[PDB]
Design an enzyme around this catalytic site. Sequence first.
Site, mmCIF file in Angstrom:
data_model
loop_
_atom_site.group_PDB
_atom_site.id
_atom_site.type_symbol
_atom_site.label_atom_id
_atom_site.label_comp_id
_atom_site.label_asym_id
_atom_site.label_seq_id
_atom_site.Cartn_x
_atom_site.Cartn_y
_atom_site.Cartn_z
ATOM 1 N N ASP C 32 0.659 -1.078 -0.023
ATOM 2 C CA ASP C 32 0.084 -0.111 -0.088
ATOM 3 C C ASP C 32 0.865 1.112 -0.213
ATOM 4 O OD1 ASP C 32 0.822 -0.656 2.437
ATOM 5 O OD2 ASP C 32 -0.996 -0.177 3.564
ATOM 6 N N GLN E 17 -5.502 6.661 -3.712
ATOM 7 C CA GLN E 17 -6.005 5.295 -3.488
ATOM 8 C C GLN E 17 -5.127 4.646 -2.803
ATOM 9 O OE1 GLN E 17 -7.540 3.396 -7.070
ATOM 10 N NE2 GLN E 17 -7.136 5.095 -8.260
ATOM 11 N N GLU E 18 -5.486 3.622 -2.242
ATOM 12 C CA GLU E 18 -4.593 2.667 -1.325
ATOM 13 C C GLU E 18 -3.869 3.647 -0.208
ATOM 14 O OE1 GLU E 18 -5.123 -0.604 -2.863
ATOM 15 O OE2 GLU E 18 -4.823 -0.859 -0.635
ATOM 16 N N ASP E 19 -4.498 4.213 0.786
ATOM 17 C CA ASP E 19 -3.928 4.968 1.731
ATOM 18 C C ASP E 19 -3.245 6.294 1.376
ATOM 19 O OD1 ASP E 19 -5.046 3.162 3.883
ATOM 20 O OD2 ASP E 19 -3.333 1.905 3.250
ATOM 21 N N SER E 20 -3.154 6.672 0.093
ATOM 22 C CA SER E 20 -2.392 8.005 -0.323
ATOM 23 C C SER E 20 -3.441 8.955 0.065
ATOM 24 C CB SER E 20 -2.428 8.039 -1.826
ATOM 25 O OG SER E 20 -0.866 7.202 -1.818
#
Lengths: 66, 56, 113, 56, 142, 51, 84, 263, 45
Positions: C32, E17-20
């Site tokens: 992530d 997206q994805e914790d950004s």
Amino acid sequence: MIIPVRCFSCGKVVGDKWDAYLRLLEEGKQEGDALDELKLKRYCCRRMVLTHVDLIEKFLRYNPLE
Amino acid sequence: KKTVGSGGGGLIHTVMREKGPKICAELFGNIQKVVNYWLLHNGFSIGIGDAIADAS
Amino acid sequence: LHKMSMMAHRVKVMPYSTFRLNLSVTSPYNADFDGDEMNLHVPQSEETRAELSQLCAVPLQIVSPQSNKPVMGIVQDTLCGVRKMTLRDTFIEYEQVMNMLFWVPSWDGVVPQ
Amino acid sequence: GNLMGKRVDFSARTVISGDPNLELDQVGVPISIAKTLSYPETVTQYNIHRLTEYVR
Amino acid sequence: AGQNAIVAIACYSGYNQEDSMIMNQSSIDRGLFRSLFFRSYMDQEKRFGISIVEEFEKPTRATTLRLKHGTYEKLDEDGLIAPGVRVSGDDIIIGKTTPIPHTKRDASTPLRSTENGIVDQVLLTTNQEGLKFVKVRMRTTK
Amino acid sequence: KVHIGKVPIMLRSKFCSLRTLDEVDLYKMKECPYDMGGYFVINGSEKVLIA
Amino acid sequence: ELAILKEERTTTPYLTKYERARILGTRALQISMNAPVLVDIEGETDPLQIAMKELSQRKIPLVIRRYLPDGSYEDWGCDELIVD
Amino acid sequence: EPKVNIINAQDDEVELMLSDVNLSLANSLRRTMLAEVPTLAIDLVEIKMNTSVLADEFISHRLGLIPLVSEDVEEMKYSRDCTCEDYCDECSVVLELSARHEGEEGTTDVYSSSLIKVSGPGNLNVGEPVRRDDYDQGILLCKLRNHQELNIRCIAKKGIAKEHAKWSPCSAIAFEYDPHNKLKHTDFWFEVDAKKEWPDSKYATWEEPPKPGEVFDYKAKPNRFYMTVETTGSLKANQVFSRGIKTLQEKLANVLFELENSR
Amino acid sequence: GVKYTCGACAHNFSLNKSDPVRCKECGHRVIYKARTKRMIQFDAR
Ligand SMILES: [Mg+2]
Ligand SMILES: [Zn+2]
Ligand SMILES: [Zn+2]
Ligand SMILES: [Zn+2]
């Protein structure tokens, strides 16, 4: 430290209203009433002025280095 | 997710086995770009009110 | 953990100090963007360049032999987006259609009816 | 620690980020990392001008 | 230990997206989440005999060996850089020379290779043994 | 009155010099009034003893 | 002795991925080392592209020596192995 | 065909209304006024001495955000376009600040009014810091104890908000259209009733509410925009609007010239 | 030599690499190098 010159979100000048805000708070005016009297409509400037902590006085309390 | 997900027998697997890895990567990019533009010009969000049910 | 955690990519030189990745390759890498650090190795010979290009390339690793199913798919916002896109009550005006059609790299230049 | 695994040259490591405007098999590399890392290319009649320009 | 930022929870452009997360560039230009960074380097002179001690001085190639490849022109006559001087990485900030048992060799501590900043403070004092003791604090902005 | 050693002193403890000192003199001694103490100073390094 | 006759070869007549990669790399390196090219060069400048073009036309002058587990080997020309 | 209606006007802000224009035109005008209107701001700080508790870069960043009068900034020349070395009189404005605390007691507050315009491209009316009134102290810059001195020489140059937010002439531009959602450009999240749970817009009385028996108009387009422009005092609101229009016109003219020269 | 300031009385003096590290009147062992007179530029951005 010291009051920021401009609001972080929009960019309104809030660095000249610190003394007026302190004077309004000194005479018993509520924080919301003082913020309204400072012509701060958007809540971004409201949190810029309301949540600021004055740490400059604590640093000034120390003796000068030179 | 049942169609464009990572599951077997989906669109990605069929496109891969039918055309090739290059075409599969092209499909990935095309779908990503189109859907990203549509979501950019449509919008999506979540809020506290989504976790609140009615009185009944 | 598996062979999909180490794949051959194509370099695109960009500003700023972070590696840029497609959102569909995060799941095979199990990564992530909350502070992950990742590594890059550069081959120094033509034979190893060809080996990386023809064996370890990302498109060749879409389908994994562990369960004969793909390991890369449409994930996160894009996935949600297509669920809001392919609904029966979704209609698009002409100008947005032209913009979206031009946004397709593989478009053939023919506007559908 | 020295035969099965070892520290190697021509390697970089940094934080990753997302990019919807990239292909599936594309990685964004910073300017500093691309300048530090290098690849030895031979000199032939097919790339003499490009290599001379890069040297200049 | 933080700031109140106006957060909008939305899927704007797919770059979060994805914790950004996406930050306003204008807010960054106005001082949002800007910070200071102070780093201190310590040095002192060690005694190796009756009269074999290290010296805090600016070294020269005529009387000192094993000099570093960094810049020595930012030092003063005492081997210490004046505060308020902008310095880059791989530069000498404290100049120390030690005699050999060209009777001296360089032992100066340079700046970190991947670090830049401005010399904020320089402190000179004496330790328990009785020799010099220097601390150089440099400040940079993140 | 034989000297037997030196015992490190925990800051803001009854035998420390910063107990009866008022705010003005605390500012004079380059000590933050918000400091709580409870740690030792060894070789210029602040050391805390985990329970 | 260890060699296997051409009429007795039992290995697959197709080019494996590993064999294809090894031949492509070797041909690219040889071309980069100023080797004669058996196909025309129109606009391509990458030695790997030249090697791929040669492989497509089945003109690479290399021989694969596939090793049986016992020790015997089979020699297959690059011009007779089927390329997908 | 385009029409302008001004609802409120003052030197700090203008609340106006545009009609018979495309949405892209209004959005481009708002973006140009937000980011592409040149102003004058401090871009170079020379610190002769600084004994205050604030860091040098702290004070420099604080000084860079102080608005300055940019009434005649159009006649000024860019630093890149100027052929002089470093900076000269006609491409920059020099300001001088000198502050010191007198006495051993109290704290001296240094504001933005202490800046003195020693030199500039005369006789253009630029460089002077913006004052709300004739007796306004200004923006608080620093605080000084005894034996603490500040001596700063600042250089102010002309720039746009794209390079840095300190050249932005306006703070926030309110912009809206279709207060009654007649075009159905948005879908209203609700729990029981959408009409009751959503507050009315401040311009809802300006447009007639939709009748319950009305049918949807698929050929309707956004044609009435309400926008309020607030400035930081560097430029007047009317000046900001006019200069944004002029900048858009100049950009289009440059594109036209490039197209003509491409043949 | 170069200017030095004391950490107690903030007194300015000078040393010539031969005097001990002490203040001139109060004898404090903590001294600091004075700020250089050279002007330094800043982008103010
Ligand atoms: Mg993680
Ligand atoms: Zn604001
Ligand atoms: Zn000039
Ligand atoms: Zn003293």
